[PDB]
Amino acid sequence: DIQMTQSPASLSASVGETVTITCRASENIYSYLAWYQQKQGKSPQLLVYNAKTLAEGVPSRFSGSGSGTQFSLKINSLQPEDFGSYYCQHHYGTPFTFGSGTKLEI
Amino acid sequence: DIQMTQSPASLSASVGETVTITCRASENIYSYLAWYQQKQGKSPQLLVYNAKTLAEGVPSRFSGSGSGTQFSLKINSLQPEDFGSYYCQHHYGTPFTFGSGTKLEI
C-alpha cells in the first residue's frame, strides 16, 4: 500500500526544449520505479524501468533518475511526437500503482 | 547578444509538490544567471543569482543549479504563495535579457 505523487499535473512547452517530470513515493522503494508513456488512445508504453534503465527502442532523449522516494524523468529536445501523458508506477510492493499523471502539451 | 530559452511555458501543480523550471543560454555564461519571481502585479523579486545563491529572505525551498548553458530552478513543496511568473536573466554580456517566462499555477 504505497502512495505515488506525480507532478506537475500538466506542463506546456515547445519542440526543442527540455522538461522535467517528478514522482515521489510515500515509502522508500529503492529503484523499483518505472515510467510509462501514453499517447492518442493506446496502451501505456514502457519508457524507463528500474529508475533509470531505458526500454528497447526508446529514444536517448529520455532519461530517468532518482532513488528512494524521489525520482524524475527528464526529456531533452522535445520532439513533436512526445506530447501525451506520462505515468510513473512503482514496481515494489503489490499492488503496483500509478501516479496521477502528467499531461504534456505544446 | 545572448538568447535565453526558458521552459516550460507554464505548468500546473498542487501545493506540497515539487516542480522544476529550466533555462538554456545560446552561449556559455558560466554562473552569471539569476532567477526572478513576479506575482500579482509587482516588480520582479530576486530569488537566486549567480546560478545557485539565494537572495536575502528567500525561502529555503528555492534552489537554483546549473552552469555553462543549462540552469534550473527547483521549487520544493509549493506553498500557495509561490504561484506566479518566474523569469531567468543572464548577468553576463550586456545587454542583460530575460527568458520567455514560466507561468506556474494550481
CATH of the domain at B15: 2.60.40.10
Task: Report d(CA B53, CA B84) in Å as an integer.
Answer: 21
Residue in B with minimal Cα distance to A17: B7
Interface residue of B7, B14, B71 to substitute, partner A, most A CBs within 10 Å: B7
In Å, the largest CA–CA distance within chain A is: 38
Question: How far from each other are the two terminal CA atoms of chain A, in whole angstroms?
Answer: 35
Q: What whole-number distance in Å separates Cα of residue A57 and Cα of residue A11?
A: 25
CB contact under 8 A, A7 and B20: no
- Among chain B residues, the shortest Cα distance to A104 is held by B11
Q: For residues B63 and B55, is the Cβ–Cβ distance under 8 A?
A: no
Nearest to B20 among A17, A20, A24 (CB): A20
> Which method resolved this structure?
X-ray
A-chain residues near B5 (CB < 8 A): 17
- What is the number of structural domains in chain B? 1
Cβ contacts (< 8 Å) between A86 and chain B: which residues? Answer: none
Cell numbers for B18 = 515539487
* Inter-residue contact A82 to A106 (CB < 8 Å): no
Dist. CA A42–CA B38, nearest whole Å? 40
Give the helix, strand, coil percentages of chain A, each rounded to 5. Answer: 5, 50, 50
**DSSP at A58:** -
Note down the domain range covering B97.
1-106
DSSP classification of residue A94 = S
- Please give the Cα distance from A91 to A70 (Å, whole number): 14
- Please enumerate in sequence order all residues whose Cβ is within 8 A of that of B90, keeping only pairs 6 or more positions apart, or say none: B2, B4, B25, B29, B32, B33, B34, B96, B97
Q: B18 to chain A: nearest residue by CA? A: A7
Inter-chain residue contact B7 with A19, CB threshold 8 Å = yes
**Order of strands across the sheet that contains A19-25:** A4-7, A19-25, A70-75, A62-67
Q: What is the C-alpha separation between B18 and B26, in angstroms, rounded?
A: 27
| Cα–Cα distance measured from residue A71 to residue B98, given in angstroms and rounded to the nearest whole number | 30
Nearest Cα to B62, choosing from B78, B38, B45? B78
List the single best residue of A19, A20, A65, A71 to mutate versus B (max B Cβ within 10 A).
A20
Burial class (CB in 10 A: 0-12, 13-18, 19+), A77: exposed
Nearest-angstrom CA–CA distance, B37 and B16: 19
The answer to whether A85 and A36 are in contact (CB under 8 A) is no
The answer for residues whose C-beta is within 8 angstroms of residue B4's C-beta and 6 or more apart is: B23, B24, B25, B26, B88, B89, B90, B97, B98, B99, B100
